Amino acid sequence: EIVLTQSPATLSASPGERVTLTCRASRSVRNNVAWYQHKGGQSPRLLIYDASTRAAGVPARFSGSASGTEFTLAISNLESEDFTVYFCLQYNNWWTFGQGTRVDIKRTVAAPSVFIFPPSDEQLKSGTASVVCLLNNFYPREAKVQWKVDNALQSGNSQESVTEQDSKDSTYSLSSTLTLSKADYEKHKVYACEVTHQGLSSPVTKSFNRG
Amino acid sequence: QVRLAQYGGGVKRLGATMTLSCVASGYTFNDYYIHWVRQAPGQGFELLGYIDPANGRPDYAGALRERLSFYRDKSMETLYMDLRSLRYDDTAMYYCVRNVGTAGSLLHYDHWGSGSPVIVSSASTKGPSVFPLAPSSGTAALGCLVKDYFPEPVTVSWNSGALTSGVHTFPAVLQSSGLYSLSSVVTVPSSSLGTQTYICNVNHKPSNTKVDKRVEPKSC
Amino acid sequence: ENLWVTVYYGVPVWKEAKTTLFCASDAKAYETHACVPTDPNPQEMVLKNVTENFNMWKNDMVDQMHEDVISLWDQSLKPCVKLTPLCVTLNCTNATASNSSIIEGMKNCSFNITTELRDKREKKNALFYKLDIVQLDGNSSQYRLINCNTSVITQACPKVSFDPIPIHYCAPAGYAILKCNNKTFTGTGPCNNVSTVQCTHGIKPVVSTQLLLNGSLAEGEIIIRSENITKNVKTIIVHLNESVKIECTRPNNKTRTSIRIGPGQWFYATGQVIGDIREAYCNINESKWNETLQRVSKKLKEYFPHKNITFQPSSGGDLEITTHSFNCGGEFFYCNTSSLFNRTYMANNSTRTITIHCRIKQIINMWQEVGRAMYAPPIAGNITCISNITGLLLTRDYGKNNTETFRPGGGNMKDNWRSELYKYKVVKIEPLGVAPTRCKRRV
Amino acid sequence: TASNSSIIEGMKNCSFNITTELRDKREKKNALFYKLDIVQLDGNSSQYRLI
Secondary structure, three states, rough: OOOOOOOEEEEEOOOOOOOEEEEEEEEEEEEOOEEEOOOOOOOOOEEEEEEOOOOOOOOEEEEEOOOOOOOEEOOOOOOOOHOEEEEEEEEOOEEEEEEEEEEEEEOOEEEEEEEEEEOHHHHHHHOOOEEEEEEEEEEOOOOOEEEEOOOEEEOOEEEEEEEEOOOOOOOOOOOOEEEEEEHHHHHOEEEEEEEEEOOOOOOOOEEEOOO | OOOOOOEEEEEEEEOEEEEEEEOOOOOOOOOOOOEEEEEEOOOOOOEEEOOOOOOOOOOEEOOOOOOEEEEEOOOOOOOEEEEEOHHHHOOEEEEEEEEEEEEEEOOOOOOOOOOEEEEEEOOOOOOOOEEOOOOOEEEEEEEEEEEEEEEOEEEEEEHHHOOOOEEOOOOOOOOOOOOOEEEEEEEHHHHHOOOOOEEEEEEEOOOEEEEEEEEEHHOO | OOOEEEEEEEOEEEOOOOOOOEEOOOOOOOOOOOOOOOOOOOOOOEOOOOOOOEEEOOHHHHHHHHHHHHHHHHHHOOOOOOOOHHHOEEEEEOOOOOOOOOOOOOOEEEEEEEEOOOOOEEOOOOEHHHHHHEOOOOOOOOOHHHHHHOOOEEEOOOOOOOOOOOEEEEEEOOEEEEOOOOOOOOEEEEEEOOOEEOOOEOOOOOOOOOEEOOOOOOOOOOOOEEEOOOOOOOEEEEEEEEEEEEEEEEEEEEEEEEEEOOOEEEEEEEEEOOOOOOOOEEEEOOHHHHHHHHHHHHHHHOOOOOOOOOOOOOOOOOHHHHHHEEEOOOEEEEEOOOOOOOOEEEEOOOOEEEEEEEEEOOOOOOOOOOOEEEEEEOOOOEEEEEEEEEEEEEEEOOOOOEEEEEOOOOOHHHHHHHHHHHHHHOEEHHHEEEEEEOOOOOO | OOOOOOOOOOOOOEEEEEEEEOOOOOEEEEEOEEEHEEEEEEOOOEEEEEE
């Protein structure tokens, strides 16, 4: 039943800053809420339960409060090792979880570099024709990509992937894939990818003809 | 001081029964519940159901009452989970977790455990296929695609380690076919395309197959 | 103006605390606990305009009772003979009578044991119910007692027949007990008919699951109590007023046989069986049961305004919760109760009598612990006991869609006593205070 | 059973009889001991007893 809406999906900050997280709820759940810590390939751990009370061994720089139908978490003084993902949790009706928000390195906007690759003949022989579209070195993370063949939007048979933010310059890179059958590949003539990002005024588009 | 360790897991075949396990440590076995929670990659968590160690009561989630099973023994402080008819979409991580509780209410989770993955596929050991991402035609991007291999992981390098500058490698992803694939890219000036050669050097340990693929031959 | 301190002594006022309590014994008790301390004559005094709060989920003496019961049992069982030498390899096929399947531990088994002299061995045999036996690996003719791989087994002293004698508590000098009497109280919140007493009324240490029996009855209409920190409660208590009677019987005639272990301690078991064989059973007046369930359903919806209500039988766990467990005489019972809860509802006296089929197993574990399996000596002849019930323990699944569900549980021995001490809260008096006045020494 | 035994001299692979899961049955095992907790009985130098 209960659903928690977690926003924003990302927050940008630098060491020494104060960062505030937020969690929204479908309906009132009293003060019954908690915040958890999670890291790469590790065991999550307790931070705050009852929305106000800290647990043993926790650093003293964590704090938060409730807002009736909303919940707020804040890091008073951000440390380098505090960069991770967090998610809000509620325990009023039946257990559920959020999606998870990540802390991000603060830097300026930068548009992506776009490329496209038609199918390779060696791969095309298998009849599992697949296509690739790439975005490299952009910022921030939040963005979207779209696949179109003959100006027709495609979904279900495509995938998305993302890299870790490159530390030396703090830019993200994204790639996606499309998969097709040889018969469908013959049926469709022109293939294209579309991109949307903060640093681009208009959707940058790339396309190619078969062969 | 208190720990929860896991055993078992590993790869399993599609449609087959599977097991997991958690072993308690010396805090107390009769005074706390246990929960099982899982996490599909790139998805929000969900819950399965909670088993009390005292008497053995289960209480399943609403979406899985036909397929799950719990039971325990207090003598050795052990808990076993049975899952039947593994569907493709159950591939994810599994944890055990303790759960503080008063005499009349349940509050939260406060001590997560080791973490154990499970992978479902119908394939045996199988080596990758390699296809280059030839550059298009002042700076151009090129890469290589590795396709249809199992199990993880794989090794990738460029020009025998002589062209690692600016290389980005996306993490591998499990397909609907049951085989892993990934991609890696590198950027070079357009002029270098007509005066240089590029190599993708890949080696897959489980099969120990190796590939050295050229990228430039189709710089169209 | 110019007021001065007056220091009154012994003014009535109290604060909450927790303290040890005296335990009283009946005037004609069993005969440290057998015949002492003394039994007083209780009295109850009603008061006016008394403001006070209660909390049945936090009050103290609930915890204390857990210690007292276990202490009593430990005292009773501690000196009795251990059974350690008996735990040896059994060899049995046991199909010597037309009735073998239902018990499978039959006379004519055999296990080597020590005779009354310490360096000679003898062969004997007796009965056992297969629920107290397990099979070793490989040869399917070898067997072992269930709890002997992990603990020692102690036998109830044959001359001991402890039964639920009532117990009531008296506060020690300086503390006072408050009772409350409002008949619609939920178990948590304020009261407006406060009262004080010499001591509590009787309470029986009854052991049972899926419903509490031989207990007292409510004063008004049915009540439902629960915690209110979060809907995801552990155990919801429902308290009855109208007593639905129940009977249970065990027709077969058991024959007592014995063995002696030296130096000076005897061992008991079941031997010959007399009469035709049947499974133990019980009876219920479907009229009363369905009417009570109707009233419970129409009261239960108050916390769940609009969803449908449907019952289903318990699920999983050892037999201590899958079934109803209670003891009459000197032997235990387990009763499947699927038929008595397969009902449903939605918003907007001997006819149809029902029967239920039970089983009895000898070896028992104190519901909580490991390591202390009790062994019961069989009782010869037939046994029957009238009984009546007063409440139910309900836990709830994940509420889904437009329907909500309850199912019977209650394996934690704590809750049973929680259902008979919601009344009392113990406090301490502070007989000292101050105030202003104007009186003068006049020396 | 190792490059040196005199240092400890209680090695895996002493062995002694002991009671198994159930009384009327016996089993064989082995474990280590430092000789400072062992003494030799008279005569047969292969028999030992806890000090």
